[PDB]
Amino acid sequence: SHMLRPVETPTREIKKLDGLWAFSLDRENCGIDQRWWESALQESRAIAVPGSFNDQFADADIRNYAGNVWYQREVFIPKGWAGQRIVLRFDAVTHYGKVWVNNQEVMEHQGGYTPFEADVTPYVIAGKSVRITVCVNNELNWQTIPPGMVITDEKKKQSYFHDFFNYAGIHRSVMLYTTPNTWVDDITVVTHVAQDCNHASVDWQVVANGDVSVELRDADQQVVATGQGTSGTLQVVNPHLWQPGEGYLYELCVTAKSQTECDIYPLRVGIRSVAVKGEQFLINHKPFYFTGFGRHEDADLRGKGFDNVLMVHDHALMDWIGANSYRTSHYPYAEEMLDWADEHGIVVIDETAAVGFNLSLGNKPKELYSEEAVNGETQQAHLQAIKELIARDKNHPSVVMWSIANEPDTRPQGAREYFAPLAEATRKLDPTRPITCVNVMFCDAHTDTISDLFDVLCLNRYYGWYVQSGDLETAEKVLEKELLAWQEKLHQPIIITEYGVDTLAGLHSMYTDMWSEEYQCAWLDMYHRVFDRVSAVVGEQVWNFADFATSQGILRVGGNKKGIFTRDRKPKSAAFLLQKRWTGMNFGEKPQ
Amino acid sequence: SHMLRPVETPTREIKKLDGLWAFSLDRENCGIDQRWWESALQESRAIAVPGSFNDQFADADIRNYAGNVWYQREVFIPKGWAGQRIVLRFDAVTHYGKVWVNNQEVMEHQGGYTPFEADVTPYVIAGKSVRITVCVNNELNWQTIPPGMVITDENGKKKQSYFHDFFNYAGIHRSVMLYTTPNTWVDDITVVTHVAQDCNHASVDWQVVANGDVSVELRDADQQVVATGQGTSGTLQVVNPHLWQPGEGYLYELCVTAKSQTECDIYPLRVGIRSVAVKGEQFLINHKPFYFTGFGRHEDADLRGKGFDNVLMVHDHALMDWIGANSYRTSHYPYAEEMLDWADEHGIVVIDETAAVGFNLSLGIGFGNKPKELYSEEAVNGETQQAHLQAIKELIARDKNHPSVVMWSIANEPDTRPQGAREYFAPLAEATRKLDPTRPITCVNVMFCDAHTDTISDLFDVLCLNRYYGWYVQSGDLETAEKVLEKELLAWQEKLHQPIIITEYGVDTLAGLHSMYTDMWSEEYQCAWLDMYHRVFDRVSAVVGEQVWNFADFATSQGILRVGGNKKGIFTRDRKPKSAAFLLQKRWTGMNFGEKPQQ
């Protein structure tokens, strides 16, 4: 469970395994039987790690593959790591990985978007080359997060219920890292902030197999507070709060000392509180207004693979357009993104991979919550996905809210019985952040059965698109009516976590009609006018930052075209509309 | 200067410094005066290394910047490296870099496209963090490869003028790393692979520089020792050798051990056993005629500019393999060495080119006022020629052992009309042959320096012609273009009786522009015009190759000739195929591998 982000210290080294690996499909599904991990993969080819495997090859038969694929490389253990605790770590393997070091099985993970690792000290020798084999499986069933159904025809075909392509592979960094045989295994900080903002407290809890001391250092490396033992509270006079748009960070240096060994782990800490009060979202006791995007991890060639240039360029576009926030739609993002948000003061709604709990979007069993679909084991798997997300992200000050799912069908019998325990367990795992369950349009104010269990109303709305098609005048009436009915029903802060229309870049129309750039601008504008008239709306996240790949079908013109930007990051007209609205408002303040 | 590719060995470790660095412009040019390397960069932002700096930020003022920029990060020296020789290496900094480790100046390099490195043993402590600062300059002048002119406006604002048809991207384009050797190490290796006529025997010469006794083991792809030797130099005999063949690329491994009394070093060099030679109008690989198919390329992609990237390299190789391409040219600069490791392993044939494009003031591509004499003290001069010689030396020192590299191109499209041209190029031709006698040389020929006009192609072994009849002239007229093209190729065959590679033929093609009139800029014209070239090539016995310009659409300087860039791609910049990709697929997969097509 304990999952600290590897960082280089006087007591910790890292060796990235990113680069070219050997790669092989297993159409006969005989690689486990033939123990492929005991040899060089036969009939293999070069693949980039990190990256989705699907689009690296310009090959439809690989892109559409369902089953196991195999990655392998050789790596030299640094000579100096003799006597040291050596960990092998995968930041993310989509959706399942099993790992062998030479002929030793070392670890296994279900969940495509959070890290897994094993201590491999006993199975490697410092100064020698070792063989790493990974069996990666991209199949979804009713107990995976997200769910799906594999149909077999004779040949496997993956069915799934979410509007983004089922990219798979080693999407994020692989690495070896070291600790001493005494080490800091875990840290929780809780950051309290007086109402007047003129004092703050920092609770710590540490797990380590040796005596623990902590030093809190400011941005200038001046020690502002010190403590001892596994737990306690640091007092901070006149603290530099972590504020949206700035993101001042302290460093909590955790030392675990044995008589013989010592370990130093620096954790970035942003001093901020988050709370809902009535229909206001407060950060450091001040109302905040969310602007920005639903995103995806999606790009040409690399699929959902992490990439620094893309992270730099996309943050430069969000900065320029005046976005203050985003949501990790619809899975945990690369941790680098949360390190970025921490440092630049970007506000994040951190979401699990639990999209698709919904059989009514655009074969399938009769009852959504039943033994044959979302069941007891599904709910366990969902709890595990929430635990892994919070265990990874609990200390990121940029994360202001947990979204435990996107667009579940809450009409059917058993929805509330499924969600209640998940809402409760989320609050116990992290009491410091509000929780949400992002709401599908047809589960309206008069229909939805679970919104009372959550703190903030995150509504996905597309009136004037899938319904009242091309009619802004009717869409505006229906939208305003529904937001006010939500305000009346629950008196929670409302974030519109999804509003957008498919827009084909370069399609221009004097009739302002669907798919045109001019429609995208008129439709976003109508939404904005309505949001500004409703006092409960504390945010707006446009769907989507950029055009992204989907499953093939008649609704998707080479993918999802709701982007503000093209997949190659070129702006549509609507990017300039958002630039003016979001840079023209006062930072973090509801427009008028 | 000795430049072995770093590889992990029982005696050698590597630590990549790729990732996010601190970045700053220096618009006032006060960073050397204020010694910016002595502290945190002051007004900095995160940048990805490797990558061009220009397009990471969606910011015109950064994209169009001329002068110095500043890169910086901190890094821990691995504790276990104590007692090891520690080297800091940049695979490429475009166009100039100076490097500091804390406050010690350690390195400087001019030349945007090959590696530089320094022994930093004395300036670091194993187990402690050091600060690496890089001052990177992107300015071209008449002594840079490639050349250019910085125009300073009346307000002191710098604008880069340059004479080549690709955008002057700059930054740390390739991997940065620390690596170790023991204090005894293999510093340099040259192999020469000789191949009997009958192909049933081969010999492998070796030469090694190292501060210790040298032994070699040649191992086949199964890791079985086929030959052993001793000393800094000698010859290994190989019975029934598995030749490095185009389309397969079988590799041996030459393990070089340097042993002192106390420590030792093991360096494995991949060796492809193959001979290259020109005989008459044939280009011979392993004594058999070869026919080149494939592309002029560029290092160019969305967002990252000329930055290296594994996913792009995997995807592009899968597109070249699919379309039936057997070869490419590193137009117009040395490419990331990972490309030549790929070519070695899969048997792709490569024309390795220097960065010496732009030696030509009479094209319409690039971009103040051009000097009147191209070869003069005030333009291409003695110091330019020295800088060009240095660029050729550095390329060969890097690539001399890649079996995939079958020919050196020392420049692209110089103006060879003036008398100065032969005076400048002759000594460069001679010095290239001395540096590597195992490969033929070329100088890629511009269209207006025709068979009746050109003054230097006799000094080279292979005629690499860049031709665009029916585009820049005889615009849209396939009938006239075809006559002029055939006439000129036959005039070249008569004049020099060399093998001819068409190293550039292409037309601007806007993806999705379709025409029933088969006229310029349409997908249909791209198809009809490449087809007309193919028909002419197949009627000329001297034509041993065809490399389409270009693999993919790529960025250029803004101007009236370039519709958001160069649109001569077979693929779009996002790697989507134009109709002409399917035309090339049929011709190149329908011919016999490596064999001149027929009518």
Coordinates of N, CA and C in Angstrom, one line a residue, chain A residues 149-232:
Chain A
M149 N -16.8 -5.9 -21.4 CA -17.1 -7.3 -21.8 C -16.3 -7.7 -23.0
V150 N -15.4 -8.7 -22.8 CA -14.7 -9.4 -24.0 C -15.7 -10.4 -24.5
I151 N -16.0 -10.2 -25.8 CA -16.8 -11.2 -26.7 C -15.7 -12.1 -27.5
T152 N -15.9 -13.4 -27.5 CA -15.1 -14.3 -28.3 C -16.0 -14.8 -29.5
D153 N -15.5 -14.7 -30.8 CA -16.3 -14.9 -32.0 C -16.1 -16.3 -32.6
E154 N -14.9 -16.9 -32.5 CA -14.6 -18.3 -32.9 C -14.4 -19.1 -31.6
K155 N -11.5 -15.6 -31.6 CA -11.1 -14.2 -31.8 C -11.7 -13.3 -30.7
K156 N -10.9 -12.6 -30.0 CA -11.4 -11.7 -28.9 C -11.7 -10.3 -29.4
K157 N -12.8 -9.7 -29.0 CA -13.3 -8.4 -29.3 C -13.7 -7.7 -28.0
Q158 N -13.0 -6.7 -27.5 CA -13.3 -6.0 -26.3 C -14.4 -5.0 -26.4
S159 N -15.5 -5.2 -25.8 CA -16.6 -4.2 -25.6 C -16.3 -3.4 -24.3
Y160 N -16.5 -2.1 -24.3 CA -16.4 -1.2 -23.1 C -17.3 0.1 -23.3
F161 N -17.6 0.8 -22.2 CA -18.8 1.7 -22.1 C -18.3 3.2 -22.1
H162 N -17.0 3.5 -22.2 CA -16.5 4.8 -22.1 C -16.0 5.4 -23.4
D163 N -16.0 6.7 -23.6 CA -15.8 7.4 -24.9 C -14.3 7.8 -25.0
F164 N -13.4 6.9 -24.8 CA -12.0 7.1 -25.2 C -11.4 5.7 -25.4
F165 N -10.5 5.7 -26.4 CA -9.9 4.4 -26.9 C -9.2 3.6 -25.8
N166 N -9.3 2.3 -25.8 CA -8.8 1.4 -24.8 C -7.3 1.2 -25.0
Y167 N -6.5 2.2 -25.0 CA -5.1 2.2 -25.1 C -4.5 1.4 -24.0
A168 N -3.4 0.7 -24.2 CA -2.8 -0.2 -23.3 C -1.2 -0.2 -23.5
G169 N -0.5 -0.7 -22.5 CA 0.9 -0.9 -22.5 C 1.6 -0.3 -21.2
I170 N 2.9 -0.1 -21.3 CA 3.7 0.6 -20.2 C 3.7 2.1 -20.5
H171 N 2.7 2.8 -20.0 CA 2.4 4.2 -20.3 C 3.3 5.2 -19.6
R172 N 4.0 4.7 -18.5 CA 4.7 5.6 -17.7 C 6.1 5.0 -17.3
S173 N 6.9 5.7 -16.7 CA 8.3 5.4 -16.4 C 8.4 4.1 -15.7
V174 N 9.4 3.3 -16.0 CA 9.9 2.1 -15.3 C 11.2 2.5 -14.6
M175 N 11.5 2.0 -13.5 CA 12.8 2.4 -12.8 C 13.2 1.3 -11.8
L176 N 14.5 1.2 -11.6 CA 15.1 0.7 -10.3 C 15.4 1.8 -9.4
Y177 N 15.2 1.7 -8.1 CA 15.7 2.7 -7.1 C 16.2 2.0 -5.9
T178 N 17.0 2.7 -5.1 CA 17.6 2.2 -3.9 C 17.1 3.0 -2.6
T179 N 17.0 2.3 -1.5 CA 17.0 2.9 -0.1 C 18.1 2.2 0.6
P180 N 18.5 2.7 1.8 CA 19.2 1.9 2.8 C 18.2 0.9 3.4
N181 N 18.8 -0.1 4.2 CA 18.0 -1.2 4.7 C 17.1 -0.7 6.0
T182 N 17.4 0.5 6.4 CA 16.5 1.4 7.2 C 16.0 2.5 6.2
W183 N 14.7 2.7 6.1 CA 14.1 3.6 5.1 C 12.8 4.2 5.6
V184 N 12.5 5.4 5.1 CA 11.2 6.1 5.2 C 10.3 5.4 4.2
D185 N 9.3 4.7 4.7 CA 8.4 3.8 3.8 C 7.1 4.6 3.5
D186 N 6.7 5.6 4.3 CA 5.4 6.3 4.2 C 5.4 7.6 4.9
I187 N 4.7 8.6 4.4 CA 4.5 9.9 5.1 C 3.0 10.4 4.8
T188 N 2.2 10.8 5.8 CA 1.0 11.6 5.6 C 1.2 13.0 6.2
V189 N 1.0 14.1 5.5 CA 0.9 15.4 6.1 C -0.5 15.9 6.1
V190 N -1.0 16.6 7.1 CA -2.3 17.3 7.1 C -1.9 18.8 7.4
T191 N -2.5 19.7 6.6 CA -2.1 21.1 6.5 C -3.2 21.9 7.0
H192 N -3.3 22.3 8.3 CA -4.4 23.1 8.9 C -4.0 24.6 8.7
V193 N -5.0 25.5 8.5 CA -4.8 26.9 8.3 C -5.8 27.7 9.1
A194 N -5.4 28.5 10.0 CA -6.3 29.4 10.8 C -7.2 30.2 9.8
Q195 N -8.3 30.7 10.3 CA -9.3 31.4 9.5 C -8.8 32.7 8.9
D196 N -8.0 33.4 9.8 CA -7.3 34.7 9.5 C -6.2 34.5 8.5
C197 N -5.7 33.2 8.4 CA -4.7 32.8 7.4 C -3.3 33.1 7.9
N198 N -3.1 33.6 9.2 CA -1.9 34.2 9.8 C -1.1 33.2 10.6
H199 N -1.6 32.0 10.7 CA -0.9 30.8 11.4 C -1.4 29.6 10.6
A200 N -0.6 28.5 10.6 CA -0.9 27.2 10.1 C -0.2 26.2 10.9
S201 N -0.7 24.9 10.9 CA -0.1 23.8 11.6 C 0.1 22.7 10.5
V202 N 1.2 21.9 10.7 CA 1.4 20.8 9.8 C 1.5 19.5 10.6
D203 N 0.5 18.6 10.6 CA 0.6 17.3 11.2 C 1.5 16.5 10.3
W204 N 2.2 15.5 10.9 CA 2.9 14.5 10.1 C 2.6 13.1 10.7
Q205 N 2.6 12.1 9.9 CA 2.7 10.7 10.3 C 3.7 10.0 9.4
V206 N 4.7 9.3 9.9 CA 5.7 8.6 9.1 C 5.7 7.1 9.5
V207 N 5.9 6.2 8.5 CA 6.3 4.8 8.8 C 7.7 4.6 8.4
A208 N 8.6 4.1 9.2 CA 10.0 3.7 8.9 C 10.5 2.7 10.0
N209 N 11.5 1.9 9.6 CA 12.1 0.8 10.5 C 13.3 1.4 11.3
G210 N 13.2 2.7 11.8 CA 14.2 3.4 12.6 C 13.7 4.7 13.1
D211 N 14.4 5.3 14.0 CA 14.0 6.6 14.7 C 13.8 7.7 13.7
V212 N 12.8 8.5 13.9 CA 12.3 9.5 12.9 C 12.4 10.9 13.5
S213 N 13.1 11.8 12.7 CA 13.1 13.3 12.9 C 12.6 13.9 11.6
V214 N 12.0 15.1 11.7 CA 11.5 15.9 10.5 C 12.0 17.3 10.7
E215 N 12.3 18.0 9.6 CA 12.6 19.4 9.5 C 11.7 20.0 8.4
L216 N 10.9 21.0 8.7 CA 10.2 21.8 7.7 C 11.0 23.0 7.2
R217 N 11.4 23.0 5.9 CA 12.2 24.1 5.3 C 11.3 25.0 4.4
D218 N 11.5 26.3 4.4 CA 10.7 27.2 3.5 C 11.4 27.1 2.1
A219 N 10.9 27.8 1.1 CA 11.4 27.8 -0.3 C 12.9 28.3 -0.3
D220 N 13.4 29.0 0.7 CA 14.8 29.5 0.8 C 15.7 28.5 1.5
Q221 N 15.1 27.4 2.0 CA 15.9 26.3 2.7 C 16.1 26.7 4.2
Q222 N 15.3 27.6 4.8 CA 15.4 28.0 6.2 C 14.4 27.1 7.0
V223 N 15.0 26.4 8.0 CA 14.2 25.5 8.9 C 13.3 26.3 9.7
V224 N 11.9 26.1 9.6 CA 10.9 26.9 10.2 C 10.3 26.1 11.4
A225 N 10.5 24.8 11.4 CA 10.0 23.9 12.5 C 10.7 22.5 12.4
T226 N 10.8 21.8 13.5 CA 11.4 20.5 13.7 C 10.6 19.7 14.7
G227 N 10.6 18.4 14.5 CA 9.9 17.4 15.4 C 10.6 16.1 15.4
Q228 N 10.1 15.2 16.2 CA 10.7 13.8 16.5 C 9.5 12.8 16.6
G229 N 9.8 11.6 16.4 CA 8.9 10.4 16.4 C 8.1 10.2 15.1
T230 N 7.4 9.1 15.1 CA 6.6 8.6 14.0 C 5.5 9.7 13.7
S231 N 5.0 10.5 14.7 CA 3.9 11.4 14.4 C 4.0 12.7 15.2
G232 N 3.3 13.8 14.8 CA 3.2 15.0 15.6 C 2.7 16.2 14.8

